[PDB]
Every structure is written in C-alpha cells, then in structure tokens.
A and B are shown apart, each in its own frame.
With several copies, the nearest count.
Chain A
C-alpha cells in the first residue's frame, strides 16, 4: 500500500544525489533506504524490522562520521585548506575589485515603471535611464541630462524593498563604464577579480597574473613564465598524517603521557563513583534510617543540575588565589592548593569534581540493583550474627559487582573520552612545556586530538587529528575484541 509512495521517494531524492555531484552521499542513501523497503515489504526478514531503524541511526549519525573522519586522515584537511575544489574556485570567482568609480544613485517612479538616476562628482554631469521595470538581469543604458526626473525620490524603505531587482540591474554610462548597486545610495563599477577559461586557469584582472591549481599543497599558485591564493582546497595525502604520528618526537612524548592520565582518571573515577554510590545506595534503603525519601532526593539533586553548569560553577569555586573553596580552605587550614597551576592538584580537582557528578548515576544504579538481592540472605546473615560491615563486604558488595561489572566498564569508556569536563573546567590543565602541538597535564586523548585540530595556535590540522583519532580507535577496538 505505502511501499509505492515510499518507493517513489527512494528515487526522487536518490536521483538528486547523482545529480549535483555528491557521489559521497549518494551510495549510502540508496543502500540504507533500499534495505528498509527490502526488509519491511516481505515477512521473511521480520526480525530486521525491529533492528533496522535503530541501526539506521548507528549507520547515519555514528558510523558514517567515523568512516568519513577516517577518510579525512588521508588528506591535508585544515583551517587554511578546508573546502573542496568547486567551492574554493567559486569563492575566488565570487569576489570582485572596483574597476570604475562611485556614482550616487536615485530611484524615481514614472507610473508603474521606475526610473534610475546617477551622478558623477568628478565631472558634475548627471545621467538617467528610461522608464524600466524591476525583475531579472537587465542592462540600463543611461543618458546624460541637465534636467530633473519627474516624480519624487524613492525613500530607503522603497529602494530596500527592491534591493534584489536593483542589484541585478547593471547600468552603464553613455560613454563611461559599466556600474552596479554597491549600497542603497551608491552605484560603482564592480567587476570580477578573476576569470576562468577552458582549462583550470584563473587569471587576475587587476594585477594581470595567471594562477594554476597546485594539487600537492592544495592551493592556487603562479609560475614564472610565488603568490598563493589562500582560500585553499582539500587534496589527498595518502599515508602522511599517520606517519607523522610515528615520526614526530614532540607529538609522541605527551601522546603516551596523557594516555596514562586518561586511563587512570577513568579508573579512579569509576572506583570512587561506585564506592560512594553503592555505600549511599545501601544506606538510603536501610530499614532503620528515617528520612530516606528526604535523603534520597538531596543526594540526587546534583544529577538534576546539567554537567556543563556544575562544571562551570566549580571552575569558579576552585579558583586558586580567589574563589570560594580556597577562601574557606585558608580559614580552617592555612593552605591554598593550586587547583589550576599544579598538574597533580588539578588532577585532584578533576577527580573530586567528576566524582560529584558521577556518584548519582552509580547510586541510582546500585539502588534498584540492590533490590535484586532477596531479603532472606540478610535475615539468614542476621541469624549468623553479622554486622553492617560484614553484611557489606561478604554479601552485598560481591553480589552487587557481578551485575554491575558491564555498567562500570561502560562507565570507564565514558570517562575515557569525557571531553566536556576537561574542556570546560581546565581546558587541558597546565600546559606541557616544550611541545610542538597543544598539550596540557589534564588533557585526555580526545582533548589532545581536539586541541590539535581546532584550538588557535599550535596548528589547526584536522587531517592530523583525524589520523590520531583513527590510530586510537583501532587500538581500542583491538583491545576490546581481545578482552
């Protein structure tokens, strides 16, 4: 019934991918969408109907950007060298240089048909068009005149309302040069900066220099029959970004250093979040405790506050000389820990903060997960004469860890790439001294790779970071499959 209508869209939108270039996003659109109709039509592949729409998202908005960003590793994609060839030359063709001079223009109605008027200040003589109509690209051949136009001058609003039609009007003087709309009160002789002939050769009209696309560096360049036109365009560079990771000494030293921090940070986080979460989870549903519901919500409240604002308020509270934590910390004690300047102290801050954010997730886990333990084990333990600490380490803990293991190795993987925490709180921590690329002491692998690609200064090589992201990902895949 609906297979035909949807089947037509798989073709209507699919053929438009083939047109307008875009081979990169033309294959996947057919393959994924053909599978949907392939699956949902017949009732032999019934099981895939429930899996398709979930794995469609995995394909589109997780797997594709991964496969795509791996292809970015085999090229010089950067801030300078960002666009494709067709966008880059279109950017160069779009700009212009002022060949002629400025003329103050006016707009005067003659019935429905409008009328334009220009004025040259160098000569003093004025020019004016015939009764034209707005719409489409038209060349208004102006005529010199001493007299005034009939009808009142059009105000800004009126000429603004006809900005689109007035910009397409390319007027020209009796024996002067061509001229177009530059502002709402001025016309000026705007002309293309470059011109593209048959073969790929742009040529400047002002200076008089030809440029050819050097597809090694990825820029337009000139040869002595040199200048480099720096809008830039992407071009493949095989195994260069990858080999630079193994070649570069400055990049290689902190690469493993942060890997130790990254893993340790995610380990310590998981331990403390579980430990605090589980202990609280046990206490909250402990028979004898009174204000359970009151205690329960208060301990959850942190989780009700978005991470990114809790981090930014902590960023303020943890200030070294000022900030309210050290205002107290040099009152009960006589110390002000360098939460930002010192690597270790900054790592302690990260963990203390991160635990504050992380324990509620673990508590809510352990709370419901603890009700999986039947009551009569503790009643049996009460007959034997076990205390709270004995009940915890001999029954509760070893019985909770088994189901909790997958969630806390999943919690490890989360913290392993906890980008938002590092960027917002420390932005990588104290800078590692004597590095080529930007690296700090609280930087994770994900932060380091982000810092390389985007952060101003220290290069903005998207292709290099794309290689490192690939280089890391495949190692974690090799680690995860073996584990």
Chain B
C-alpha cells in the first residue's frame, strides 16, 4: 500500500500525451488526481490499476515493479465511474464476486459482505439487483466490492460524479471517515476541486497530461505553481488581470494595471526571473478582495450579476478596462442592485503573479497552515 511512479509515460501511436511523470505516494495517504475532462486523470488511475499499458517508466506498489503484472495481482481495487455493477448478479454477489470465484467460502462471504454492508448500510438490499437500486445505493455497492476485497491500494474513478449535489456533499464526509478508519492508500480521480481540497492529503493537478503541481490542499490554494493550478482551485474562479511589469525589488515586484487610471502596486512576490515591460497575469481570489473603504487600491465598475447564496453574496463587476468580469465575494447578504456602481479593494499581500509562460512568481507573504 505505497504506490509510486518514476518517469511514467503513455502514448497512443506517435502522440505522447504525458511526458515522464513522478509520484511518491506514502502508506495510507489520500491522494487525489484532479483536472478537466480528458487530462489523463483516469488513464493514470487505470495505468496504476493495470487496465492500461505503460509506454515507458516504472510503476511500483509496495516497492515492487507492477508494469508487467496483471491487474488481479496488484493488491489494488477499483471503483469504476459507471460503478461496473454486474446486472445479472445480486448486490451481495456483486460485492463478493472476486472472492466468490477462486476460493468459494460461503461463511467467509456472508461475514465479509454483511460487515461491509453494515458500515455502508446495504444490509437490507443484499438480495436486490443493480437495476432496482438508486444511484446513491448503486455507488456504495461499487465501494463495498473493494471493501470486501480489502486491497492494499484503493482506486476511485470519479466516484461521486453522477450523484445529486446534496448527496455528493454527504458522501465526501463518508469517504473521509471511511479513509481514516481503514487508513489505507486511496488514489482518487475527480474533476471537482471541492472534492480535492477536503478529501485529499496530497493533490495532483493535471494539465492535459502534464503534472501541473503536487502538494497539500492549502499549499496549492495559497501557492499555485502556475496560472492553471491557480485557476483550477477555488469555489469561484480566481480573477486574472492583465498587468504590465514596471519595477522590481529583492522582496517584491511592481506592476501596472490595464486601466485608464494606470495605477501601480508592489506585490510581495519572487522577483527572480522577471523582467520590466513584461505582460503578466495578476492573480486575486474573489474571497481575498476587500471593501473599497479599507484598501487604497480601488477597482470600480458596473455590476452585472449578483448571486445571492444566502450565506454569502457573489458580485460580478464589469470593470471598463479588462473584458472579463471581476468576481467579488462577501459573507452574509449584501444589498447591491444589478447595474449599479460598485467599488472593491485590492490587497497586495494576497496577490499572485504569473509570467508569460504561465509560471507563478513564488509568493513571499507567509500564509497559515503551511
């Protein structure tokens, strides 16, 4: 239960999707692969599972190479995106099929299935068939299958994907309690950043086959390695303002906004490998923006959209300077009419800066929980 990759590579014909990637996943670590649709989350998971070949590179699980080893003999169990429930078999048989075939032990099955069905609450549906079960129930059957199998490593391929928002939120808690109870390694594919931040001890952001960044939830959030990881993590997306670089210092970097009021501001950020007169993206999360009265760097424009979430208010502002509405976020309700003028404060301490290639300038402001 300690999977690890070294220069792993996949290619369909001459098309090389993923250049040599490395991962060091420790014992009992909740790892989460994240990215858009078709960025190589599932291919990785399936390459780990043995369902897909490795074109080049070493895959170890428990310090032993697994490339040529078939999926069955990898000490690994998968929860498929479609659940992969055998329609003809019952729920109990769906969960036990693996250990039913090869060493059929009636009493062993009965015990393992019922004990797993106890913790997942599938006890009263063991004699049912996959068609009868609701999606939420159907999902926990696919989970049970791996729990009954008791693999060293767990693989989950977008497990909460086809579930109701409310039920998707509830299952996250179940998976977090399920993980730290069993305490075994879990590799977890998903597109939702929300699911990564809460479940994962380590996250792997995948940009079209390339590994964008590997690290802890709060490390990725506070210190993205590039514009991609910055834009990917965040309930509402980060605001990216086109800014020209004007000056530089050892402890900070100065940049010029794209507005007619060409205001300038020093950011506490790695100045190493940056040039003056360069065009860059100012990163700033909707949550970190302050009210106008507080900060000195004001940003003012017409409000287009005002989403009242109850617990907070999300305001989209048309700044007549950048053609990309600035998203503001604030707790409690904020009575703001749509079409009305609204100003917001930009705090320099909470500002990212990404180069032409997209690489983030390493922030210098220390943040909590890192």
Are A and B in contact, CB atoms below 8 Å, in the complex?
yes
| A residues adjacent to B (C-beta < 8 A) | 374, 376-377, 379-386, 390, 394-395, 398-399, 402
- Interchain nearest-CB distance for B151 vs A (Å): 9
Secondary structure of the A side of the interface? helix
Q: Are B101 and A395 in contact (CB under 8 A)?
A: no
Give Cα A402–Cα B86 distance, bound, in whole angstroms. Answer: 14
Give Cα A376–Cα B84 distance, bound, in whole angstroms. Answer: 6
Chain A residues whose C-beta falls within 8 Å of the C-beta of B68 in the assembled complex: none
Given contacts A376-B80, A379-B51, A379-B80, whether A384 and B98 have CB atoms under 8 Å apart is: yes
Q: Are A383 and B77 in contact (CB under 8 A)?
A: yes
Per-residue interface assignment for chain B, residues 142 to 185, with 1 indicating a CB less than 8 Å from any chain A CB and 0 otherwise:
00010001000000000000000000000000000000000000
Per-residue interface assignment for chain B, residues 22 to 48, with 1 indicating a CB less than 8 Å from any chain A CB and 0 otherwise:
000000000000000000000000000
Q: Are A382 and B71 in contact (CB under 8 A)?
A: yes
- Interchain nearest-CB distance for A401 vs B (Å): 9
User: 21 A-B Cβ contacts within 8 A?
Assistant: A376-B81, A376-B84, A379-B51, A379-B80, A379-B84, A380-B84, A380-B145, A381-B97, A382-B50, A382-B70, A382-B72, A383-B72, A383-B98, A384-B72, A384-B97, A385-B98, A385-B102, A386-B101, A394-B97, A394-B101, A399-B88
Residue in contact with B76 in the complex, picked from A381, A383, A390, CB distance below 8 Å:
A383
Give Cα A386–Cα B73 distance, bound, in whole angstroms. Answer: 11
Give the residue name and chain of the A residue nearest to B155 (CB): A383
Give the residue name and chain of the A residue nearest to B81 (CB): A376
CB of B87 within 8 Å of the partner chain: yes
User: Sorted from nearest, which 8 A-B pairs have the closest CB atoms?
Assistant: A385-B72, A380-B84, A384-B98, A376-B84, A376-B80, A398-B88, A383-B71, A382-B71
Q: Are B78 and A380 in contact (CB under 8 A)?
A: yes
| B residues adjacent to A (C-beta < 8 A) | 49-51, 70-73, 76-78, 80-82, 84, 86-88, 97-99, 101-102, 145, 149
Q: Are B49 and A384 in contact (CB under 8 A)?
A: no
- Interchain nearest-CB distance for B185 vs A (Å): 16
Chain A residues whose C-beta falls within 8 Å of the C-beta of B70 in the assembled complex: 382, 385
Give Cα A380–Cα B145 distance, bound, in whole angstroms. Answer: 10
Given contacts A376-B84, A382-B51, A399-B87, 7 further A-B contacts (CB under 8 A): A379-B51, A379-B78, A383-B76, A383-B77, A384-B99, A385-B72, A386-B101
Residue in contact with B86 in the complex, picked from A379, A383, A390, A395, CB distance below 8 Å:
A395
- Interchain nearest-CB distance for A373 vs B (Å): 10
- Interchain nearest-CB distance for B344 vs A (Å): 44
Chain B residues whose C-beta falls within 8 Å of the C-beta of A385 in the assembled complex: 70-73, 98, 101-102
- Interchain nearest-CB distance for B42 vs A (Å): 11
- Interchain nearest-CB distance for B350 vs A (Å): 45
Chain B residues whose C-beta falls within 8 Å of the C-beta of A390 in the assembled complex: 101
Give Cα A384–Cα B102 distance, bound, in whole angstroms. Answer: 9
- Interchain nearest-CB distance for B102 vs A (Å): 6
Residue picked from A374, A394, A399, most chain B C-beta under 10 Å: A394
Chain B residues whose C-beta falls within 8 Å of the C-beta of A376 in the assembled complex: 80-82, 84
Give Cα A333–Cα B360 distance, bound, in whole angstroms. Answer: 82
Chain A residues whose C-beta falls within 8 Å of the C-beta of B87 in the assembled complex: 399
Residue in contact with A374 in the complex, picked from B71, B82, B97, B101, CB distance below 8 Å:
B82
Give Cα A402–Cα B73 distance, bound, in whole angstroms. Answer: 32
Q: Are B84 and A384 in contact (CB under 8 A)?
A: no
Give the residue name and chain of the A residue nearest to B73 (CB): A385
Chain B residues whose C-beta falls within 8 Å of the C-beta of A398 in the assembled complex: 88
Q: Are B88 and A402 in contact (CB under 8 A)?
A: yes
Q: Are B78 and A383 in contact (CB under 8 A)?
A: yes
Give the residue name and chain of the A residue nearest to B87 (CB): A399
- Interchain nearest-CB distance for A358 vs B (Å): 26
Chain B residues whose C-beta falls within 8 Å of the C-beta of A379 in the assembled complex: 51, 78, 80, 84
Give the residue name and chain of the A residue nearest to B86 (CB): A377
Chain B residues whose C-beta falls within 8 Å of the C-beta of A399 in the assembled complex: 86-88
Given contacts A390-B101, A398-B88, whether A383 and B82 have CB atoms under 8 Å apart is: no
Residue picked from A379, A383, A399, A402, most chain B C-beta under 10 Å: A383
Given contacts A385-B73, A402-B88, whether A380 and B80 have CB atoms under 8 Å apart is: yes
Residue in contact with B149 in the complex, picked from A384, A394, A395, A402, CB distance below 8 Å:
A384
Chain A residues whose C-beta falls within 8 Å of the C-beta of B97 in the assembled complex: 381, 384, 394
Give Cα A236–Cα B72 distance, bound, in whole angstroms. Answer: 61
Chain A residues whose C-beta falls within 8 Å of the C-beta of B50 in the assembled complex: 382-383
Chain A residues whose C-beta falls within 8 Å of the C-beta of B145 in the assembled complex: 380
Give Cα A351–Cα B25 distance, bound, in whole angstroms. Answer: 61
Give Cα A200–Cα B98 distance, bound, in whole angstroms. Answer: 74
Chain B residues whose C-beta falls within 8 Å of the C-beta of A381 in the assembled complex: 97
Give Cα A384–Cα B50 distance, bound, in whole angstroms. Answer: 12
Given contacts A376-B82, A379-B80, whether A384 and B88 have CB atoms under 8 Å apart is: no
Give Cα A398–Cα B73 distance, bound, in whole angstroms. Answer: 26
Chain B residues whose C-beta falls within 8 Å of the C-beta of A377 in the assembled complex: 84, 86
- Interchain nearest-CB distance for B207 vs A (Å): 26
- Interchain nearest-CB distance for B351 vs A (Å): 45
Chain A residues whose C-beta falls within 8 Å of the C-beta of B86 in the assembled complex: 377, 380, 395, 399
- Interchain nearest-CB distance for A384 vs B (Å): 4
Give Cα A435–Cα B76 distance, bound, in whole angstroms. Answer: 71
Chain A residues whose C-beta falls within 8 Å of the C-beta of B102 in the assembled complex: 384-385
Give Cα A428–Cα B77 distance, bound, in whole angstroms. Answer: 60
- Interchain nearest-CB distance for A146 vs B (Å): 92
Chain A residues whose C-beta falls within 8 Å of the C-beta of B77 in the assembled complex: 383
Chain B residues whose C-beta falls within 8 Å of the C-beta of A402 in the assembled complex: 88
Chain B residues whose C-beta falls within 8 Å of the C-beta of A383 in the assembled complex: 49-51, 71-72, 76-78, 98
Q: Are B101 and A384 in contact (CB under 8 A)?
A: yes
Give the residue name and chain of the B residue nearest to A385 (CB): B72
Give the residue name and chain of the B residue nearest to A398 (CB): B88
- Interchain nearest-CB distance for A385 vs B (Å): 3
Give Cα A380–Cα B88 distance, bound, in whole angstroms. Answer: 14
- Interchain nearest-CB distance for A372 vs B (Å): 11
Chain B residues whose C-beta falls within 8 Å of the C-beta of A384 in the assembled complex: 72, 97-99, 101-102, 149
Give Cα A395–Cα B85 distance, bound, in whole angstroms. Answer: 11
Give Cα A148–Cα B72 distance, bound, in whole angstroms. Answer: 94
- Interchain nearest-CB distance for B334 vs A (Å): 40
Chain A residues whose C-beta falls within 8 Å of the C-beta of B78 in the assembled complex: 379-380, 383
- Interchain nearest-CB distance for B86 vs A (Å): 6
Give Cα A386–Cα B86 distance, bound, in whole angstroms. Answer: 14
Give Cα A402–Cα B50 distance, bound, in whole angstroms. Answer: 31
- Interchain nearest-CB distance for B18 vs A (Å): 19
Give the residue name and chain of the B residue nearest to A379 (CB): B51
- Interchain nearest-CB distance for A55 vs B (Å): 28
Give Cα A395–Cα B100 distance, bound, in whole angstroms. Answer: 13
- Interchain nearest-CB distance for A46 vs B (Å): 13
Give the residue name and chain of the A residue nearest to B102 (CB): A385
Chain A residues whose C-beta falls within 8 Å of the C-beta of B73 in the assembled complex: 385
Give Cα A278–Cα B86 distance, bound, in whole angstroms. Answer: 20
Give the residue name and chain of the A residue nearest to B79 (CB): A380
- Interchain nearest-CB distance for A44 vs B (Å): 16
Give Cα A376–Cα B51 distance, bound, in whole angstroms. Answer: 10
Give the residue name and chain of the A residue nearest to B74 (CB): A383
- Interchain nearest-CB distance for A389 vs B (Å): 10
Give Cα A405–Cα B82 distance, bound, in whole angstroms. Answer: 27
Chain B residues whose C-beta falls within 8 Å of the C-beta of A382 in the assembled complex: 50-51, 70-72
Give Cα A383–Cα B45 distance, bound, in whole angstroms. Answer: 13
